[PDB]
Design an enzyme around this catalytic site. Structure first.
Site, PDB file in Angstrom:
ATOM      1  N   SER A 136       1.072  -1.180  -0.021  1.00  0.00           N
ATOM      2  CA  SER A 136       0.042   0.044  -0.012  1.00  0.00           C
ATOM      3  C   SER A 136       0.985   1.420   0.006  1.00  0.00           C
ATOM      4  O   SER A 136       0.671   2.091  -0.936  1.00  0.00           O
ATOM      5  CB  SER A 136      -0.826   0.016   1.067  1.00  0.00           C
ATOM      6  OG  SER A 136      -1.694  -1.165   1.048  1.00  0.00           O
ATOM      7  N   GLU A 137       1.751   1.416   0.846  1.00  0.00           N
ATOM      8  CA  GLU A 137       2.599   2.606   0.995  1.00  0.00           C
ATOM      9  C   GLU A 137       3.630   2.744  -0.133  1.00  0.00           C
ATOM     10  O   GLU A 137       3.739   3.953  -0.485  1.00  0.00           O
ATOM     11  CB  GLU A 137       3.130   2.921   2.328  1.00  0.00           C
ATOM     12  CG  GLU A 137       2.034   2.932   3.609  1.00  0.00           C
ATOM     13  CD  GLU A 137       1.148   3.650   3.626  1.00  0.00           C
ATOM     14  OE1 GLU A 137       0.999   4.640   2.910  1.00  0.00           O
ATOM     15  OE2 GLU A 137       0.476   3.660   4.759  1.00  0.00           O
ATOM     16  N   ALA A 138       4.122   1.686  -0.500  1.00  0.00           N
ATOM     17  CA  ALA A 138       5.183   1.823  -1.749  1.00  0.00           C
ATOM     18  C   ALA A 138       4.522   2.086  -2.996  1.00  0.00           C
ATOM     19  O   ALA A 138       4.936   2.912  -3.700  1.00  0.00           O
ATOM     20  CB  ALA A 138       5.684   0.508  -1.830  1.00  0.00           C
TER      21      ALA A 138
END
Ligand code: NA
EC number: 3.2.2.22
Length: 244
Positions: A160-162
């Site tokens: 999700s964050e990448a």
């Protein structure tokens, strides 16, 4: 809808290809400032995508993501599914992993504040990098419940964050055979995704200007106030925007 990453023989390049494929798996309304703006509504059959991750030991988990916001709803390992204790994941469990023999509601919701409380550990003290992701897959595949909350924070930041930020993708993918503790710059990007996304959408009918300033920490650990779409985080980092 499916995207796969294998830790065995992983490189910075193979991680990059995975994160590009993840971004490309999500339907988009249009681009704002060349950033995909995700759909506000979809057919149920298109609402969730699966990421397959395989660790060095050749153990696979499947991770369910809400394509309208890149949030992780839950995961599957063999004949067990596991869902966050949150209404969004209860809805997801109607569409994904329905054939699992056992459905587990995890003790906690998927937000970092509850994950950190469940783990007894904050993100700043949890190593990231490809070897950390390999360990996280092992923990989740066996559901070693005392390490699961920490593992889920590795997994979310690595997916999700990448996908949301080039800078996170780059920092995680650079650690192929080592680990690192994430900087305040990485934490700040994760914490501020929702607020920054909102202000970029507002900016597009407001001559590029935010309505509400956003405070980030930069890669020199300085506090910076963001007020417009010319900020580096908008031109050269953020990679996906949710609809409100
Ligand atoms: Na723990």
């Amino acid at each position: 809808m499916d995207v796969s990453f294998r830790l065995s023989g992983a490189t910075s390049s193979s991680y990059g290809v995975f994160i590009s494929n993840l971004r490309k798996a999500l339907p988009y309304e249009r681009k704002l400032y060349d950033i995909p703006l995700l759909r506000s509504t979809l057919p149920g059959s298109q609402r969730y995508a699966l990421i397959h991750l395989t660790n060095y030991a050749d153990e696979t988990i499947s991770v369910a993501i809400d394509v309208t916001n890149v949030y992780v709803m839950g995961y599957r390992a063999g004949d067990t599914s596991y869902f966050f204790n949150e209404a969004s994941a209860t809805e997801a469990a109607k569409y994904v992993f329905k054939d699992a023999k056992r459905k587990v509601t995890l003790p906690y919701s998927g937000n970092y504040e509850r994950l950190q409380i469940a783990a007894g550990k904050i993100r700043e003290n949890i190593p990231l990098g490809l070897p950390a992701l390999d360990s996280a897959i092992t923990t989740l595949f066996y559901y070693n419940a005392n390490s699961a909350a920490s593992a889920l924070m590795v997994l979310i930041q690595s997916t999700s964050e990448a996908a949301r930020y080039k800078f996170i993708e780059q920092q995680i993918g650079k650690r192929v055979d080592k680990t690192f503790l994430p900087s305040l710059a990485i934490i700040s990007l994760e914490n501020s995704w929702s607020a920054l996304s909102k202000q970029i959408q507002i900016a597009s009918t407001n001559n590029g200007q935010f309505e509400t300033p956003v405070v980030l920490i930069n890669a020199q650990n300085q506090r910076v106030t963001i007020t417009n779409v010319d900020a580096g985080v908008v031109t050269s980092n953020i990679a996906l925007l949710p609809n409100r």
